[PDB]
Subunit: 103 residues, 5 copies
């Protein structure tokens, strides 16, 4: 299996790496019906979503989606540096597929 | 798909953005029957709930309701600055739909 | 809908408010069969349980029971000041219905 | 309903209280099949498990077993002082039934 | 039942102990389809996965797999020293079976 986010991201169609090397600037979370999601931004204005669970997910990606929103919240609150995100770039905002964190 | 809490709130009827730019002053949680809910307040007396799950919520919102109460608890304990709340204003106290945090 | 713990407590029979204004002194939790519960005390010796889930609880409370134990453990570990508890006072020890944290 | 760990421990056969008054020295966790468990140690070498779930457990204990593992991990990572453990002494290592924390 | 990670690790085929005595250098998390997993690395370049749940795993392991990803995330964010890992060495990268923390 790939051993880093760059290699993991490159296996998938319609994906790309954003290199942030920065903490999350804002964290937004919604419980509204059909927008049960999180949205993050960085200081540079880059904005990312964790997608609303739907038909494009295999429904074990379901637990993974919830984990990812947990990780973004704790990263925000701990000012953890986000190294890279692997995103689907065919969504607006870009939708997070993977995150890497390093000091 | 919205990129911020203001645009997301505008997708919903009978909602309003409140801007607090302040940490939560009090956090209340209840397990009592029919009042399984959370209430937050700010120093200025603004008071909001996460509603008891009911018929105004769809299946997809149930997990998000639990998530939002987790988020408010950790935000209170971290003294995290709350930027904005998107709220349903036909409820008293007003009911949270979404939160944004930035500092 | 109540906007504070005192008003919420008054919607039930056999409840009362304790005003602690103090951090949790001790936190005890048990996985022993039929005693799957938590117990907290304060420096003045006031002692409270989260009750074992049983037939006296409705389905909607089961998540909220789990949540309350999560809340008491993180409040203990962060030395958070507990303002008030709403408790059923026909249990020994008093059983927690709601909690408020402020200051 | 007991009001302290010592009184809870005395409801059960084959138990005893260990009085540690110290933080957890090591935390071990396993996902290997048939050893889905946690093990903690103290500096003096006292060693305790949270049992692998099985037919020795009633249904109401399964959430509490998961909770106890959560509690031990956060206790370890916060260096929380463990006052007492109630354990079954007919297991090797001794199996945790309850924990109390105080400072 | 084993009392430490080395003895646990000797219970399985195709496993070995790695002794790190270091905090995790990076934490990677993916929800990408069929690759829902975490990857950690240490400063020496040692790289480990928590494997995607699949047919090598029995039902009793599924909660433990999710727990182990929770553990690595919080270990990462607390800069907790990892003492040893027990891994399956017939995977790439080596797959985590168990973890011990001590400092
Ligand atoms: C506890 C209390 O009475 N506080 C009030 C504020 O009202 C609460 O908070 C607002 C946001 C809402 O959730 C109310 O239902 C609560 O009782 C009150 O805020 C104003 O409330 C009105 C309600 O229609 C509008 O939301 C305004 O936009 C708010 O400014 C303030 C000011 O009147 O006074 C107390 O702090
Ligand atoms: C361990 C012990 O005996 N503690 C007592 C207090 O009682 C405990 O805490 C109260 C809140 C209740 O849960 C009891 O069942 C516990 O044993 C005791 O508190 C008073 O308790 C009575 C009820 O029995 C009323 O609730 C009063 O409002 C409480 O002040 C205090 C003071 O009497 O003494 C020991 O700390
Ligand atoms: C190539 C890389 O990114 N790192 C390597 C180490 O290998 C990685 O980590 C090990 C533990 C294993 O998961 C490999 O699959 C990874 O690529 C490599 O560690 C040694 O790896 C060998 C197996 O190839 C043995 O497991 C040794 O015990 C490990 O120390 C080291 C060489 O020491 O080089 C880079 O750090
Ligand atoms: C809120 C906003 O419009 N911000 C702009 C950035 O765009 C956002 O973030 C990127 C990563 C995508 O999720 C966008 O959909 C989102 O609106 C914008 O970032 C650039 O977006 C490009 C696509 O339009 C592309 O992904 C590029 O890689 C990325 O750098 C930046 C720079 O143009 O400006 C912000 O204001
Ligand atoms: C690794 C080791 O040998 N530790 C010693 C303790 O034993 C461990 O911890 C106890 C609580 C049990 O879980 C043991 O199975 C485990 O090895 C030892 O504890 C004493 O062990 C006695 C018999 O093994 C008996 O259980 C007794 O209750 C307990 O106090 C302590 C104290 O002598 O020393 C460690 O070195
Ligand atoms: Ca800062
Ligand atoms: Ca402060
Ligand atoms: Ca202190
Ligand atoms: Ca220390
Ligand atoms: Ca550091």
């Amino acid at each position: 299996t790939p051993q880093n986010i760059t290699d993991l991201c490159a296996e998938y169609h319609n994906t790309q790496i954003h290199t942030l090397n920065d903490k999350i600037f804002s964290y937004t979370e919604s419980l509204a019906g059909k927008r049960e999601m999180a949205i993050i931004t960085f200081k540079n204005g880059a904005t990312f979503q964790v997608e609303v669970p739907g038909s494009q997910h295999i429904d074990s990606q379901k637990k993974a989606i919830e984990r990812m929103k947990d990780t973004l919240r704790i990263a925000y609150l701990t000012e953890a540096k986000v190294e890279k995100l692997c995103v689907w770039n065919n969504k607006t905002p870009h939708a997070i597929a993977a995150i890497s964190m390093a000091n």
